[PDB]
Symmetry: C2
Subunit: 549 residues, 2 copies
């Protein structure tokens, strides 16, 4: 057991990554009533392994990875954030403030009764509400408070112990209440309700007929023979444009026998045209027919957007389906706001390239990774989380969470505004969201493992129960209020309570249960509540440690 | 300048991530004769920023990220490794040993002349050949050596200084010689030569006609009306199988007017069938027609693989193109080795599902991420890099590099053998390869920044020139030998020299210049040379520090 501990402490990489492996395993496992979050599995694994020896927490590792997690969350919700805000901002901020005042009142009422102290009280606050800066705030506060050095040392030792005692439950029990008990209580399904709430907003588009380019070998005896490519393109209805005979786009070459006519358009229209002209389709050994996404530069005329078809170029929505000609006027640009609309040009390389150069600039493929963009994002997230101020002598700061969310939001919004620059693949963003918070949790659990059982031994039974009460009851009361009176959206209420409590494990877990469809809406509903609750709790800890004097 | 330094040292996250942003920028920039590696840009940025204050290097950060980089390299080359080995293993190991003996002889000849000492000699070795364990080996060696404490302290202080002095050049100049001067010297292009060398091996398949399922509305007046689906499927030649009338796979329902016949097969064959039967194509609003990749369980009969077509199921290669019926015998499984071949089943959900259950199990989509697999991989990479032994009192160990490469190799090979389990997306693997080594470089450069200029001031001019010579000349001599005599593959020689020198920046840079096509072949050509050179250099440092006495 001690050789195990020596090897472990001497190999932190292995100690931490084996914590994540078994953690994700425990998360995957389940009995029936939903499953355990990968985050919760990693937490359990880390708290158990930490019982072997002593494990020093790196604050330049868990910090980096929590930054990754929150910046990914913020960078995914960038576009859909403003809309979900304009939709439910009033309701979500009301819920956040209701939960905050209810938590304050509950903590005050519980600390009025029971053997209670200011250090233990601040520890219960920091632990049961999942706030690791309340410790620092209340510690500096009690330092400023005019008390004997012995009492100050006593409280400064008591606070972190009770924090780690209540932290396990503040992370697990509240998560299980918000993710499992709370949906079933509102008589809904988390996944279905979330995906339908997101569909209700313009962020989950429906499938579209991809307007592609087919190739047809002109066998002998067809009415198209001897006829000019331009004449055929004219004969083609709307949604169908003759991409070109053979591999050229000259609308003057005569269609001869044995050539290959390429046509761009929707599948149904192309099938009808094939039946009418009895066309023989062929694989088409040619790459000279490519589709390109172009971001329209304001003041683009549209005369070229109109002559697209007459030029052998199919213009379609960014989704893919060929766009109605009149809809060229929805690409108007007026007033300001400027989320530039993007077109898709299909056809011959020369014609498509000229129409693109006339319309705008090529949109960057999401598959490409903008390493410098990601690096600057993380750097500025850190620089903004370091920012802070003092309120009544209490030091407060955005911290990693709120600053990372804000930087992700603004950076994703700017990238969506200027779509010519590369971005971060959503696969990488999901990987960050999943791995960063779980590494943070593994480190903090390895650090607070032995401490947790020590606190269970000393002042364990009563304090842990009081902390569980303080953590769950505010959620119950604010949920009752919100749902049964204000009648807010269930997923919106869940996001608001997850934010107001600063429970980042809830973010990750509810997102992985809801899927990448309504995950943007959930993150949007969380972010503002997250910031407000972070501030008010970092201030709530010290006011309590002062009141208790 | 000092407020800058205070803010920087107080915000390591920002200090490191702004180093990566500007680093990737400097890498992107270029004049004409190729560009600067993103790694080299990050190195320059870190060495310049480090000139502000003092920056402590986290060994549980750079270590994790270098592990990520090397494990990604090893996990991508898993499948293609064994083949490239069987192809050029003799040549690559010959090149590795030739380079090692030439470097040893060059170092000995240069240390015989010039004001030379054992500490400075070991420092030049550790710096100009990019080996940060030579420091530890030679330090423990000189510790064991029976000398006055003053001399031991003198040498132990001299070694790291000369190491950091020569490290910048060992990372930049040798990289520029192997990536730019060396290809042009062999009169080739790195990208083209690499991609064609990889094409020469079965790892870059050519495009294939994707055998898809089309839908055709049975207008009135077609010869298929009143005819049974089974009869039509029979009438369909090879490569064409009637997926089913409407949305069912019963080969007894009569084809009525207004129904929709779905047909699976290649585009050319389907076009010929459409022309012959004058079929009207339609978008097809149905998901009940799906394609599934199945891993064949040994002892699968093939009778079902034969009845696939007669059942309304198109069997195709994993690539997509419908496979020749006789080729069902290439899916034989015999002897052992067992890289189970996978089929693709297209058609109706019920028929395809039954044929799959009869043939094998569903292959996992690469888009899914196996977090537990990745975690266990990193953990075991660390546990294996910790392994080591002693040779003549010299401590040696696999370290992070060789152990991570071995674990990646074996884990990727096992996942390719058992394809039912998820994997790591190649996008994530590329992101790791790019970001991990560059973070390692940023940290080590921030740490060795002030030290580098200090060493430039003290014993700077002569030592840096001698180190540049020791670093470049071995490459020149071994390249001459290999190319102009042994006549090995250019890309193979480059990979062998990159491995033998333990220059991980060369791995990353040459891979990003060659692309994901021949990058597996390059990593395969590197790995063995990497291990052998790592060992022989960790042993070469101490033997030199001993000889110099």
């Amino acid at each position: 057991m001690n050789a195990i501990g020596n090897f472990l402490v001497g190999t932190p990489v292995f100690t931490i990554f084996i914590c994540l492996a078994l953690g994700y395993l425990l998360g995957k496992l389940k009995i029936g009533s939903f499953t355990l979050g990968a985050t919760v599995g990693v937490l359990i694994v880390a708290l158990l392994i930490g019982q072997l020896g002593v494990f020093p927490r790196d604050t330049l590792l868990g910090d980096i990875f929590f930054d990754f997690f929150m910046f990914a969350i913020g960078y995914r919700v960038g576009p859909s954030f403003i809309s979900s805000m304009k939709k439910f901002g009033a309701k979500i901020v009301y819920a956040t403030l209701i939960f905050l005042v209810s938590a304050f009142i509950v903590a005050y009422a519980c600390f009025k009764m029971f053997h209670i102290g200011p250090g233990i009280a601040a520890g219960i606050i920091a632990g049961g509400l999942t706030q690791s800066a309340v410790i620092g705030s209340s510690l500096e506060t009690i330092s400023k408070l005019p008390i004997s050095d012995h009492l100050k040392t006593l409280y400064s030792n008591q606070i972190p112990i009770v924090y780690t005692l209540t932290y396990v439950f503040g992370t697990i029990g509240v998560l299980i209440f918000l993710r499992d008990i709370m949906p079933k209580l509102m008589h809904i399904d988390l996944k279905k309700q979330a995906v339908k709430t997101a569909k209700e907003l313009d962020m989950i588009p429906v499938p579209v007929i991809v307007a592609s380019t087919h190739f047809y070998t002109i066998n002998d005896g067809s009415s198209l023979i001897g006829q000019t490519l331009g004449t055929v393109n004219t004969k083609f209805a709307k949604g169908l444009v003759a991409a070109g005979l053979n591999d050229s786009a000259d609308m003057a070459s005569v269609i001869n026998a044995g050539d290959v006519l390429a046509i761009s358009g929707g599948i149904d229209e192309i099938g009808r045209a094939v039946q009418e002209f009895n066309l023989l389709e062929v694989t088409g050994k040619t790459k000279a027919y490519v589709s390109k996404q172009v971001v329209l530069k304001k003041n683009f005329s549209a005369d070229v957007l109109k002559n697209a078809q007459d030029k052998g170029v199919l213009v379609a929505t960014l989704a893919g389906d060929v766009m109605d000609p009149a809809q060229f006027s929805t690409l108007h640009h007026h007033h300001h706001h400027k989320p530039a609309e993007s077109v898709t040009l299909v056809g011959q390389k020369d014609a498509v390239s000229e129409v693109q150069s006339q319309l705008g600039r090529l949109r960057a493929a999401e598959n490409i990774i903008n390493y410098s963009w990601f690096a600057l994002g993380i750097a500025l997230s850190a620089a903004l989380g370091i920012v802070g101020t003092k309120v009544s002598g209490v030091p407060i700061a955005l911290g990693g969470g709120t600053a990372s969310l804000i930087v992700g939001l603004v950076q994703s919004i700017y990238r969506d505004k200027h779509a010519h620059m590369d971005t971060i693949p959503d696969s990488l963003l999901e990987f960050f969201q999943s791995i960063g918070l779980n590494l943070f949790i593994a480190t903090v659990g390895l650090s607070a493992a032995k401490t947790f059982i020590s606190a269970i031994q000393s002042m364990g039974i009563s304090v842990l129960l009081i902390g569980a009460v303080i953590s769950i009851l505010p959620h119950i009361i604010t949920f009752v209020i919100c749902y049964y009176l204000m009648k807010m959206e269930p997923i919106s209420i869940i996001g608001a309570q997850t934010g107001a409590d600063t429970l980042s494990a809830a973010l990750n877990d509810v997102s992985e249960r809801v899927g990448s469809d309504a995950s943007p809406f959930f993150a949007a509903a969380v972010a503002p509540a997250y910031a407000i609750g972070n501030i008010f709790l970092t201030l709530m800890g010290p006011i309590f440690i002062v009141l208790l004097s």
